[PDB]
RNA sequence: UUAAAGGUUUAUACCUUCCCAGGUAACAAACCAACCAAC
């Protein structure tokens, strides 16, 4: 028993062969079933034959007799077929309304996540089909992490170095960061968990959280977990008010937080806000100052990963009392300052899929580029509150969507808030950014932010640009352009205070060629987000959709806080590069 | 051959009046399948047979219950009713008398076994339902004896068990008897040899035996089932010392029993247009109906309100889904309208009252949510008194 | 049984041998418009019968299967239906004792081990701040349970203890705050 | 029904009543018309009603030989299980303190009650209170059976560990007591 | 009011018997499932 997904009518009709088992009113379930392939009709026990050794599994074949369902080779004389008359015999059928398009629902309950004609389907349909499609998007990466072999460590050849020998007849996960293992230790007739890893090209180069003495045996599979179904919406809904609801500002604050106390009085007129936030202008300097400035307000801050919300913890630490704060853990090290597992605490700090059931006064969505509609929907049906403070921006890196092949997710199908402050605009903006001199922020004002970003710091004249194709060569799952790394490492040698530069790129394998020739620290794009360093150095190494996304390249060259050296691929950004040029030696 | 078995020891859960944990005897599959093939047969016709002492398989309903009160009055001179229960039948039991009990129930195998077939068979017997090894909690005791409740001729073998008991008791009575005093020449003719024949004949005597059987079957009449007992005597000759009385039971019971069995287990009766004061937890009661009286079997209405309020499943805490659990109960309850007491017949009204809030209550979930309509007519007669009348009625 | 097709045949037929039997025709004729009418019901009294026998199947399939929507959603609440019907007898009940430790534990006091009915045996509480202290203990007696225990010990979370007059508002602070205490039955 | 071969026959003279009803001869020549299709819708008759009671029992057979193929399949399922279980638990048996006391038979037979007396290798008593502890488990070492045996572990109702020198008499109230202790055989 | 009986097949109508189909009701026997009571 439960509601169509169409139509809210009560049902219990649910599509077999449809992975997520929506619920589909009798006709919504007709249409399901006469315009797809799904046929297999599950509700109280299954519309299957209940003859022994049968297979009929279709409810177009089913007849309902005596007390049972048949198919037509094994039914009893007096029947009426299962199908019939438009609509599927069951629960509720009384009480139905139908829909007159099921085309949305059919698409995205037979897409493979493949294109990105789905995921803007799944941003741009119904709130309860945007709920249906995340269930069933993450339902399908989860599956398809299951689709890789199992990696067994055959030799240990030495330590940060091991030898893995694969599952036959599956394909082999690509090795990056965005792909998270789990040891396994072999034991009489079970396994214990050893941790999670990830890996590198070397052999193979492995990077455990807990560091261990892992020996021929222990093996790594893509941890996978039960996805949950649905109830709360992506967004709750707008309510616009003419004063501050809940809220009681202080009526003491310093110049540190005074620029933003018109932007937390409009958090106060609203039941939630959107919040865009260049890089380097005080993002968490904004949250954490909404809890001073309403000092009694309960507020919940929350984020998709571990490392953001200790970031909030860090930033909270420096401004909030210590006593009145809490981080959640569930039973990866983390924040570890604040007392753990307090829901009840005025400031509660967790991520997403361990948020306690709980009220509060604020709630604090932070990185919400990396949020998807389902961390969005989970929280509101895990946190009531009166108002709500999201926090990103479309300028930079999403959630990574493993399964997607074909074209370029765009940020206003991110999630329902990236979508909104796409379309509509963000609620509150901060123009101000203090990390990146102009050069950089001038740069990306124009690329991405509608020339809204203005620069706190001035031209640093350290802001460098070349263009060299190189050679791009690629191994199994990422690309290396070794001329590009060869030009890095002459302009070190004509520069020698450039070696206290980072190198990053949008791949690992470059990174990982670089760190072994010209010594720097590595990072990559996606990974190199919420940090910063003094000067960077950034390699395109191809041309790819990968490696020319605008979101990507907006976070790319901003990790620098003097200078920056770009060696580029691609004539297009290039030219955007408002850096000074070089010829090539 | 001798195949020892292992009888797991399950524990009940279920309604009753007093804190003690019962359990019960989940025995092997062997042991039913080889006693099925001798007392499949043998029992079937106990069951089956109307008007005997043993009133095993005959039902309460359309008359029975009347049948059998009726048998047991059968032309006894100065008739009381009296009635006992032994306070340990099952775990209290020597092994004598259940080999004796299990020797009378092989006697019917006279042609289809040698003597060395009915030796096996009740060594088969002996050792898994007499001494067998019991599964409790994990780990094998050695059980002492009495009777496994739970194997295939438990009833049956308790009604002999009281018909011995019975007859001992008789012949008890009997023997200590004056002797001179007895100014009945045929009783003293009986007692002389009842004596001889017990202490100084070796072989059967059938005359007196027969003899001896009428007897009893003239002075006192039994309706046995399982432990339980309901007895018409002549009371002048219990009085007399003739025939057995309740001290004589209790004597018996304290020297072959190793049990003293007190007043709160045995009750008499000396008006019998009343009936037995309790046989299988039924009251008696003598009503009217279509122009006789007849006998009517009762409850305890606590018993009645407590399985109608407490309940072992939680879907039957609602009622919707449960209603011919309530049906049930008000067949079983129908007898209380007769009672002088108002309460009683009061607790068979608020069944029937119960029964078709029930109804309506399903027929709306219906109607309302999924517009459908379930009423019909047959369950009319659910909730009036007829279809509950007719199950006391003799015609079926 | 009236919106089928046949019915319009029997219709038609019991309008033609309305009009043979008013107008008295022939003989053979109206047997003719006999022969044609009660075979008439022997495929309507056949076909108006299986489906008949259909709609009630329908309806108590509908109800077999309603009340097993309904059996396997029941034993799936069990832990909230349970709980909320007792505080709700609990609540009719009106009983000063329960009730007194229902508003104990609902705010802050709640104790260690089960309630002793003994004259003698020992109770531990644990008191979370000094309103319920206000509350419940007044110097060397504690009211609790409808009943008067006598302090014998009182110590605070950090397992130091603490001397009954010391208690007060003025080192509020200087408690630790969730204070046990310890008492025996008078 | 409709390969049959009635249908065939039924169909034609159906046709041929059609085709002559519209022309419309005469009585006299109708009446072979309307009798042949009155004998046809007989024949159909027989062979239907002689072929839609047969596809009944086919079906019933059909199940029937299919529940004793299961029935068949599950009966060898239970005998490898019950093979396997008496071969398992063979060998635990303890084979050579078990041969000696067996040869010692006049005959060979011993009762079973002292097989595990004489042989076992590991004892578990089970204690109700801390008085009957004394009498009979007291110690790190206790004798039973006419042996010595070593305690090695003792666990509670709830099976969790308790140290030997916890067992005392004034903290006998703070334990759960049918206390299991299980010792092994020592020499 | 129209000599008699007998003869044949065919058409019609009635009655009777058998057989083959279709529906209604009853009775019983089996099987399956849920529930209640007693020792
Ligand atoms: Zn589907
Ligand atoms: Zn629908
Ligand atoms: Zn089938």
């Not at chain 3, 001397?163 to 008078?186: F, G, H, K, Y």
């Amino acid at each position: 028993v439960g509601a169509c997904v169409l139509c809210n009518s009560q049902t219990s009709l649910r599509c077999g062969a449809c992975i997520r088992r929506p619920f589909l009113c009798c006709k919504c379930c007709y249409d399901h079933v006469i315009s797809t392939s799904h046929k297999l009709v599950l509700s109280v026990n299954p519309y299957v034959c209940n003859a022994p050794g049968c297979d009929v599994t279709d409810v177009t074949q089913l007849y309902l007799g005596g007390m049972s369902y048949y198919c037509k080779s094994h039914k009893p004389p007096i029947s009426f077929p299962l199908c019939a008359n438009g609509q599927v015999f069951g629960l509720y059928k009384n009480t139905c309304v139908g829909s007159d398009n099921v085309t949305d629902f059919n698409a995205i309950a037979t897409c493979d996540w493949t294109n990105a004609g789905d995921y803007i389907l799944a941003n741009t349909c119904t709130e309860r089909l945007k709920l249906f499609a995340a269930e069933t998007l993450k339902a399908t990466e989860e599956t398809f992490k299951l689709s890789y072999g199992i990696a067994t460590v055959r030799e240990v050849l030495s330590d940060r170095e091991l030898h893995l020998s694969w599952e036959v007849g599956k394909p082999r996960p690509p090795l990056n960061r965005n792909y998270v293992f789990t040891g396994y230790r072999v034991t009489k007739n079970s396994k214990v968990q050893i941790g999670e890893y990830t890996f590198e090209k070397g052999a193979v180069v492995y990077r455990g959280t807990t560091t261990y003495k892992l020996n021929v045996g222990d093996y790594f599979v893509l941890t996978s977990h039960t996805v949950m179904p649905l109830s709360a919406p992506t967004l709750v809904p707008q309510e616009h008010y003419v004063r501050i609801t809940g809220l009681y500002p202080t009526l003491n604050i310093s110049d540190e937080f005074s620029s933003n106390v018109a932007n937390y009085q409009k958090v106060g007129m609203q039941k939630y806000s959107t919040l865009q936030g260049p890089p380097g202008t005080g993002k968490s300097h904004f949250a954490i100052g909404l809890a001073l400035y309403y000092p009694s307000a309960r507020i919940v801050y929350t984020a998709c990963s571990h490392a953001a919300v200790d970031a909030l913890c860090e930033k909270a630490l420096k401004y909030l009392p210590i006593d009145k704060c809490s981080r959640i853990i569930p039973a990866v090290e983390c924040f570890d300052k604040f007392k753990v597992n307090s829901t009840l605490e005025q400031y509660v700090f967790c991520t997403v899929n361990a948020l306690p059931e709980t009220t509060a006064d604020i709630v604090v969505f932070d990185e919400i580029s990396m949020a998807t509609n389902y961390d969005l929907s989970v929280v509101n049906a895990r946190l009531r509150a009166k108002h709500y403070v999201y926090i990103g921006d479309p300028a930079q890196l999403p959630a990574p969507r493993t399964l997607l092949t074909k074209g370029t997710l765009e940020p206003e199908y991110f999630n329902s808030v990236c979508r909104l402050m796409k379309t509509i605009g963000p609620d509150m903006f901060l123009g101000t950014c203090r990390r990146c001199p102009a050069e950089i922020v001038d740069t990306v004002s124009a690329l991405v932010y509608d020339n809204k970003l203005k620069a706190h710091k001035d031209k640093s004249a350290q802001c460098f640009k070349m263009f060299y194709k190189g050679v791009i060569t690629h191994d199994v799952s990422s690309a290396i352009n070794r001329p590009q790394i060869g030009v890095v490492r002459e302009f070190l040698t004509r520069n020698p205070a450039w070696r206290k530069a980072v190198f990053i790129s949008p791949y690992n394998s470059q990174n990982a060629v670089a760190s072994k020739i010209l010594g720097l620290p590595t990072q990559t794009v996606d990974s190199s987000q919420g940090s910063e360093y003094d000067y960077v150095i950034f390699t395109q190494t191809t041309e790819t959709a990968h490696s020319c996304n605008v979101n990507r390249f907006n976070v790319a060259i901003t990790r620098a806080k003097v200078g920056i050296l770009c060696i580029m691929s691609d004539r297009d950004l290039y030219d955007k590069l408002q850096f000074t040029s070089l010829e090539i030696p | 051959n001798v195949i020892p078995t292992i009888t797991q020891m399950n524990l009940k859960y279920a309604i009753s009046a007093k804190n003690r944990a019962r359990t019960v005897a989940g025995v092997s599959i062997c042991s039913t399948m080889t006693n099925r093939q001798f007392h499949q047969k043998l029992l079937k016709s106990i069951a089956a047979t109307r008007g005997a002492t043993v009133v095993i398989g005959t039902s309460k309903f359309y008359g029975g219950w009347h049948n059998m009160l009726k048998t047991v009055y059968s032309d006894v001179e100065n008739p009381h009713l009296m009635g006992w229960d032994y306070p340990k039948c099952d775990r209290a039991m020597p092994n004598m008398l259940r080999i004796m009990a299990s020797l009378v129930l092989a006697r019917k195998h006279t042609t289809c076994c040698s003597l060395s077939h009915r030796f096996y068979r009740l060594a088969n017997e002996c050792a898994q339902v007499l001494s067998e090894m019991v599964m409790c909690g994990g780990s094998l005791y050695v059980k002492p004896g009495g009777t496994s409740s739970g194997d295939a001729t438990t009833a049956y073998a308790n009604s002999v068990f009281n018909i011995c008991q019975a007859v001992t008791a008789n012949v008890n009575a009997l023997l200590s008897t004056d002797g001179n005093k007895i100014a009945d020449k045929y009783v003293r003719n009986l007692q002389h040899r009842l004596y001889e024949c017990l202490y100084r004949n070796r072989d059967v005597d059938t005359d007196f035996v027969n003899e001896f059987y009428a007897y009893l079957r003239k002075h006192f009449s039994m309706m046995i089932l399982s432990d339980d007992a309901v007895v018409c005597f002549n009371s002048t000759y219990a009085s007399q010392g003739l025939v057995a009385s309740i001290k004589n039971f209790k004597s018996v019971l304290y020297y072959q029993n190793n049990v003293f069995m007190s007043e709160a287990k045995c009750w008499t009766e000396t008006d019998l247009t009343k009936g037995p004061h309790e046989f299988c937890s039924q009251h008696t009661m003598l009503v009217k109906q279509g122009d006789d009286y007849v006998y009517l079997p009762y409850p305890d209405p606590s018993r009645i309100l407590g399985a109608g309020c407490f309940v072992d499943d939680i879907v039957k805490t609602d009622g919707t889904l449960m209603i011919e659990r309530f049906v049930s109960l008000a067949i079983d309850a129908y007898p209380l309208t007769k009672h002088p007491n108002q309460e009683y017949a009061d607790v068979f009204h608020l069944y029937l009252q119960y029964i078709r809030k029930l109804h309506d209550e399903l027929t709306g979930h219906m109607l309302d949510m999924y517009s459908v309509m379930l009423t019909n007519d047959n369950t009319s007669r659910y909730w009036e008194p007829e279809f509950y009348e007719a199950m006391y009625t003799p015609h079926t | 049984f009236s919106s089928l097709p046949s019915y319009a045949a029997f219709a038609t037929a019991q309008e033609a041998y309305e009009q043979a039997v008013a107008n008295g025709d022939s003989e053979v004729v109206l047997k003719k418009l006999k022969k044609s009418l009660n075979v008439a019901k022997s495929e309507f009294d056949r076909d108006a019968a299986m489906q008949r026998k259909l709609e009630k199947m329908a309806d108590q399939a509908m109800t077999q299967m309603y009340k097993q929507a309904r059996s396997e959603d029941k034993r799936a609440k069990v832990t909230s239906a349970m709980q909320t019907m007792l505080f709700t007898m609990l609540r009719k009940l009106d009983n000063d004792a329960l009730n007194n430790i229902i508003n104990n534990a609902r705010d802050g006091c709640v104790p260690l081990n089960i309630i002793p009915l003994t004259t003698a045996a020992k109770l531990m509480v644990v008191i979370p701040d000094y309103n319920t202290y206000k509350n419940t203990c007044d110097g060397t007696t504690f009211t609790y349970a409808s009943a008067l225990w006598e302090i014998q010990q009182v110590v605070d979370a950090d397992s130091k203890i603490v001397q009954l007059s010391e208690i007060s508002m003025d080192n509020s602070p200087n408690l630790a705050w969730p204070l046990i205490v310890t008492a025996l039955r008078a």
